[PDB]
């Protein structure tokens, strides 16, 4: 059932999640094809929490490089509401699908990275962390416009409560996890997102994930296999003993040079990659510095890289109520 009939017809499948499905459909009013995400999350608490945080963020954000919500279709009452349909701009593909078969020119890598960071500056300026940046969450159209999507794992930044023990369970996509997630971090600081963007840049350069860990700790071992052993200064940040002693137990490895991994890459792109893929999250480049890096000089313009107008400062039955309230503005 794809019940968007008042004005949306001719549905064609796009993809799915544990609690929803994305389709493409014709908008009988605006005479344009749109994307519609059928979301059926109400039978699972986790699905409800992710749906609510995403709707709340996406309705507040307004940025060219972030997917917006154009319409929300749902029943007029909580009792009758089984599914929620989110209508958004249609994007022809995503960076995951594109990198499966297409080599990117250096100009495409530069422009796509610029747009990722431009959108990320806005996100971070609202004190929000995306926490699941990866190629499939970067939507693209035929004119190379890029929009970040999927804010289901997003959180408000909380650096004071970022500390955790070694091997703490984590939900976001393994291959794009910063090394500190496995060591001592809950992923509540902006540096978590910069690491993922660095992983995406490496993937745009080679068409393959840079750190394809097969399981939790294997992820850290792929990272260290390229970065080499953390320095004494970076080990100064790792004060939890189990994490520290795990790193000290590893054999010494020197750094794999970026120019050996990416021999066809622009040297300025590799200098920016190095700064994004910095082991110490405190030394890792921040989004505004990355925009100002020489690799992005042809696009950089801080006056045209807007920030958010203000920061973004439960059982499944109650979460369903809040989803109903949050979607009320779209009822006629």
């Amino acid at each position: 059932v794809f019940d968007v009939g008042p004005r949306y017809t001719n549905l064609s499948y796009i993809g799915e999640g544990a609690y929803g499905m994305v389709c493409s459909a014709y908008d009988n009013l605006n005479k344009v094809r749109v994307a519609i995400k059928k979301i059926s999350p109400f039978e699972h608490q986790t699905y409800c929490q992710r749906t609510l945080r995403e709707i709340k963020i996406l309705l507040r954000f307004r940025h060219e490089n972030i997917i917006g919500i154009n319409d929300i279709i749902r029943a007029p009452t909580i009792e009758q509401m089984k599914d929620v349909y989110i209508v958004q701009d249609l994007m022809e593909t995503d960076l995951y699908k594109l990198l499966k078969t297409q080599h990117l020119s250096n100009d495409h890598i530069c422009y796509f990275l610029y747009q990722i960071l431009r959108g990320l500056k806005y996100i971070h300026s609202a004190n929000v962390l995306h926490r699941d940046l990866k190629p499939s969450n970067l939507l693209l159209n035929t004119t190379c416009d890029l929009k970040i999507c999927d804010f289901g794992l997003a959180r408000v930044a909380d650096p004071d409560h970022d500390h955790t023990g070694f091997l703490t369970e984590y939900v976001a996509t393994r291959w794009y996890r910063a090394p500190e997630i496995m060591l001592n971090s809950k992923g509540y600081t902006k540096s978590i997102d910069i690491w993922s963007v660095g992983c995406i840049l490496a993937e745009m350069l080679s068409n393959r994930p840079i750190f394809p860990g097969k399981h939790y700790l294997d992820q850290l071992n792929h990272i260290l296999g390229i970065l080499g052993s953390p320095s004494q200064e970076d080990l100064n940040c790792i004060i939890n003993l189990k994490a520290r002693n795990y790193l000290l137990s590893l054999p010494h490895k020197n750094k794999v040079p970026w120019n050996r991994l990416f021999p066809n890459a622009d040297s300025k792109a590799l200098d920016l990659l190095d700064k994004m893929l910095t082991f110490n999250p405190h030394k890792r480049i921040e989004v505004e510095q990355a925009l100002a890096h020489p690799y992005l000089e042809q696009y950089y313009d801080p006056s045209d890289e807007p920030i958010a107008e203000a920061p973004f400062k439960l059982p499944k039955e109650k979460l369903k109520e809040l989803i109903f309230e949050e979607t009320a503005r779209f009822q006629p």
Binding site: S105, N106, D107, H108, Y111, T143, C144
Partner: peptide, 5 residues
């Protein structure tokens, strides 16, 4: 290369 975006 100077792609027109």
């Amino acid at each position: 290369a100077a792609l027109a975006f």
